[PDB]
Give the backbone structure.
Amino acid sequence: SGFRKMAFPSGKVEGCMVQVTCGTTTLNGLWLDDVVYCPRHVICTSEDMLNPNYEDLLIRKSNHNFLVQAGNVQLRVIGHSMQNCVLKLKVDTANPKTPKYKFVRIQPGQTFSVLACYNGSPSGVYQCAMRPNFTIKGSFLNGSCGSVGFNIDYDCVSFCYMHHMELPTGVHAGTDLEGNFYGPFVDRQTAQAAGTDTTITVNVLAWLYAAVINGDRWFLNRFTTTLNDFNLVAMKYNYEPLTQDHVDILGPLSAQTGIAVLDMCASLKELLQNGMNGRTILGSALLEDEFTPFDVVRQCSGVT
Amino acid sequence: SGFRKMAFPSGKVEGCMVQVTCGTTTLNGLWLDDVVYCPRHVICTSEDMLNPNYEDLLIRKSNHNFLVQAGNVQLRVIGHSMQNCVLKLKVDTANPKTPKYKFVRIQPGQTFSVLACYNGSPSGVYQCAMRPNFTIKGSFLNGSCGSVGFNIDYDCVSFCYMHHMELPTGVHAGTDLEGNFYGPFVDRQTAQAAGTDTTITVNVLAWLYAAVINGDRWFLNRFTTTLNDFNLVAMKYNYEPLTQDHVDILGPLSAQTGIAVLDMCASLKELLQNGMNGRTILGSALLEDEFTPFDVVRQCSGVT
Ligand SMILES: Cc1c(N)cncc1NC(=O)Cc1cccc(Cl)c1
Ligand SMILES: Cc1c(N)cncc1NC(=O)Cc1cccc(Cl)c1
């Protein structure tokens, strides 16, 4: 028992981190097989970031201008190409520590672990959710660019995020591993609106099921609701509307606890309308939305 | 910017995890050099756990009864000994993945990362604090015994905790790597009182400094206090009394923010007396005590 904001073990990803330097800019790269992936803004100076013409800036660079260092080992760059907002540096050596991996574009509301890195060296690991507005509320400083987000399915690492930038609001934006930004963002030093965010309803419900499994049950009530009624409350409180697809993925937790999904919605409705009354759920005084139903099942069943 | 409950990268510890089976009990072991460390209750059956005589139970075991498997690789056990509540199984092969390491006994209030494991395989990583009452509020299921807690100082892993058991209250107890329990606990299936716990005051103050660094400043007020006055409030609210040693370790954060430690104590006093007023600090609606002053500096400076 107990429920923590647990990250995946980061070892498989640590073995892929390298430092990439181009000119006077150093950031992190991800070395998988014989390719190093990194944010394309490694080719910019500070003056370039106002409105970079990436195609023109990259034309001034040759393979030998990309310095890639895997801790101690220096990699020889034999090709370079830009794909969306990432650079792919072909190296002459396949990473001996390449885990089985996939590149995936996650949906908003899904969770993943981030291995925060600086100068190609891992600093720490944390779990977070991709917000419905496609930002992440990470912990990143200058030099963290190129740090990646990922999930693990037994021996396979699915990389879903590469960090690119911090918005003026202090939230983070980045791309999938094909260099496509999540959200409307562009890799430029310009103030950019992140959409209105919402709370990930299906994850709050999953976390309430995690609370019941772990013995925190005070919020369970004698009520039920309907999807329609619940969604009027969700709209008022800036929660994502709940759909039958969300009810379906909550099925395993409903079955494990014997609490019908709409009865848990009625508990969530009462918590939204009344607050927590100075009480806590799983050590939190707010409704937590960074655990998916899959995360709750994995954590509560001890999947390796 | 941003502030997360960040764990150390777990790769160096993942390389040390093995599965240990003795009879019908399987748990995790830590393979460092040519020794595997694991909880001594691997030698018990369920009937034995009521009141085990560990010396007698271990006398019935020979080296060949301890099955140690490092994923695929089977280790040959050439010696066994019990040290306090841990078994040390000497194996004929030094772990090629042994990182530089130390065994340390941490103080209550200090933090560390836990690599939760099952059957010798890592499941997830999370950061937590050793409570002032020597329990940890972990996330552990049956089979997690032998999972370890650790900190990292550049290339050195300081192992501080090995997980042994879950108390009837759902909190966790374990030992240092010499097998000495933290707290009054014994490795027996008996209800055992954990002391009265308190909130780690110096860590709440460190986290308020982390909040100011990251832009959450609403709780800063026009007041100051004294150590004596603050400690009357700390006593009323079940917080650890603040000492000059705690003020001294908060010095770097006080210097970085320009907020004198006693002025931050006055903000904490007002938060204790008034609550959060439905507001949040670093995404939390309660006062967080799982970040030490060292953690805040490390996270806010990007140490690798
Ligand atoms: C400074 C920083 C922090 N704190 C966290 N994460 C990232 C950064 N780096 C940047 O945002 C630098 C940058 C500027 C403009 C566009 C792009 Cl793509 C990148
Ligand atoms: C069951 C469990 C969980 N959930 C989490 N962590 C650990 C466990 N295992 C136990 O507590 C088994 C045990 C019983 C009595 C004494 C000792 Cl030392 C160990």
In short: The CA atoms of residues 70 and 165 of chain A lie 23 Å apart.
